[PDB]
Design a protein around this ligand. Sequence first.
Ligand SMILES: N#Cc1ccc(COc2ccc3cc(S(=O)(=O)N[C@H](CCC(=O)O)C(=O)O)ccc3c2)cc1
Length: 439
Amino acid sequence: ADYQGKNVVIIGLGLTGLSCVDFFLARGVTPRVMDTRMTPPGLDKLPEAVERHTGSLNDEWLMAADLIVASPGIALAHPSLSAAADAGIEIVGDIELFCREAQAPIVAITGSNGKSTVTTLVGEMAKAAGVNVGVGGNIGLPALMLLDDECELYVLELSSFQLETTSSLQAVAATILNVTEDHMDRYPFGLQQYRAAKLRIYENAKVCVVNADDALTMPIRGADERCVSFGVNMGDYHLNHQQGETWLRVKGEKVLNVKEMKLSGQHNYTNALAALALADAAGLPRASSLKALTTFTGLPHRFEVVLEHNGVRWINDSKATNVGSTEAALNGLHVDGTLHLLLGGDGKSADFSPLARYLNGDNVRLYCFGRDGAQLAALRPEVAEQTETMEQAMRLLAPRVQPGDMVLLSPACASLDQFKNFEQRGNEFARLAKELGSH
Ligand SMILES: N#Cc1ccc(COc2ccc3cc(S(=O)(=O)N[C@H](CCC(=O)O)C(=O)O)ccc3c2)cc1
């Protein structure tokens, strides 16, 4: 692709938007930037020679554009963007720009849950092989910041939103890990429209890695010649359980006793399987890939023990931004005393009902907050309190905490109504836990 002399409009700043700005300037192209937010993140970082329009979209700029570069945080269905598409004006995102330039193979990962963990694992598998790997996308650095002629492999986490604006990805190995209800605020044609966005990841992929336990991860035409599967009891990559032990297996052969992993739990074992299938498809040596599985400690905010003190475990699962993720935390959860469960934020129009089956019995307490606090409290009103903020909920629950209890932030919602991102929510939980969890 060659952008010289084009009128380029970037919609949405933030770090993604900033990386797009830098991309064009380095190529001799001065883009214009707009954002519906008055003072979007990164505005103060925007170069002075870059024209900007904030507080609304500017239709004069949009209709004048030769290329529109849309942040994943703006819907293609926005009437302004829809009008531009109707006019035949080309719309792409940062991942599309990246794919057109990348000079190494790309492993591409998406799905409702597990995508950051699997992305990070594949990165570690590549690092263990002594491969110069760039890992990022929807996790870590925006993809464009990874572009380097000396990179030998890219491992990208791709959101459904990023995939909607991407057309030139030809992944060496691509997966949809699972599809459970999420982002319904952005998909008014429901679960299958959300699924369709993720299914794009398989277009022109050399190998497709599918979840044998989740039909929605299969291409519409069905699994094909390119399709490798992982699963619990079935799949090319699967689990073998015995007395008190679990093994990772590939086509019948044992490859790893999971006692050697630092991660635990079934969902992390299938994450390990998915990462191994991707790593194998990418040509990484099996031995170094297995070594990576034994060294990886997990990501922050992902069922992370932030304080274990006075017989109480305080767990930061702020990365649980949907119902499926909170389910993964609650399913098979052992608690000696009472579970003090923090739920809330922007629920993105999700049906929270599937959580109700995990909240029976006398040893559960719910502390519900943020935009959708009331809908979460309604799961079991008799054991629920509602506050405005997570801090209020923590100061409410802390006096009730007894030795043997668990305090679990696993909110099933986005943080964006009250926080910058789920990382900030997790960090604040950790700060408050340390204050409240000690005399
Ligand atoms: N014009 C314009 C314009 C452009 C961009 C924005 C930025 O807003 C977002 C940017 C990136 C986003 C990414 C996502 S996401 O869905 O990929 N990730 C969130 C993370 C939520 C959290 O961190 O708590 C989620 O899973 O719900 C959601 C909303 C996002 C909103 C506002 C206005």
